[PDB]
């Protein structure tokens, strides 16, 4: 079993650094590319950037450049997230995503999340923000994009946990996804639909183009339980 191990919460002074650390189990990083983002307070994931862990190369969300700094060690299998200059603003929930270098993005892993409290571009679009849905209702949540996009993937976030790949490739369901879900669109829409809800389908809903940098994600769709 694959898992990327977060170092735990920090709580630090405005004006300072902190070093975060992801170590993987089960998977050599040097295998892909080790992603780092950062969901805020509102509950949106924004993308700091990715690390190749075998050659060092590294991509940085321009927003980011300058403020983060990716190293690894890849003896001991660990991705490093340095962040500087720290502020209030900063306070969130960072997380370290390694998944499928190329090619269908099939198989996706997230740590668990470090929460870092601080003491003092291809925007796409998802509709409906919010809505209510009770079991056996059908349920179709879209995302358009500002530019055409190759592909759209789709992650399923629940109450205290990190993002989950549902719908990868538009419309490849990912492993453990129920057929009752479905993906597609092209160009610069695309939408997830629910023939029949669950109960068990109440999360938040992201939708993520992975074809132009900085990558980019939906602001999400909270789906409810009617």
């Known amino acids: 079993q694959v898992k990327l191990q977060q170092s735990g919460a920090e709580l630090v002074r405005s004006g300072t650094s902190v070093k975060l650390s992801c170590t993987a189990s089960?998977?050599?990083?040097?295998?892909?590319?080790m992603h780092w983002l950062r969901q805020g307070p509102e509950q949106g994931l924004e993308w700091i950037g990715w690390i190749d862990p075998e050659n060092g190369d590294t991509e940085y969300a321009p927003k980011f450049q300058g403020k983060a700094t990716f190293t690894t060690d890849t003896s001991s299998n660990t991705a490093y997230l340095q962040l500087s200059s720290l502020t209030s603003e900063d306070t969130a929930v960072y997380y370290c995503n390694e998944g499928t270098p190329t090619g269908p993005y099939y198989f996706d892993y997230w740590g668990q999340g470090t929460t870092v409290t601080v003491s003092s571009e291809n925007v796409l679009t998802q509709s409906p923000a919010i809505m209510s849905a009770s079991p056996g209702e059908k349920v179709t949540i879209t995302c358009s994009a500002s530019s055409s996009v190759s592909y759209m993937h789709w992650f399923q976030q629940k109450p205290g946990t990190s993002p989950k790949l549902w719908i990868y490739?538009?419309?490849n369901l990912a492993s453990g996804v129920p057929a009752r879900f479905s993906g597609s669109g092209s160009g610069t829409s695309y939408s997830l639909t629910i023939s029949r809800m669950e109960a068990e389908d109440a999360a938040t809903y992201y939708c993520q183009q992975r074809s132009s940098y900085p990558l980019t994600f939906g602001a999400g769709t909270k789906l409810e339980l009617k």
């Open positions: 089960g998977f050599n990083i040097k295998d892909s590319y």
């Open positions: 490739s538009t419309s």
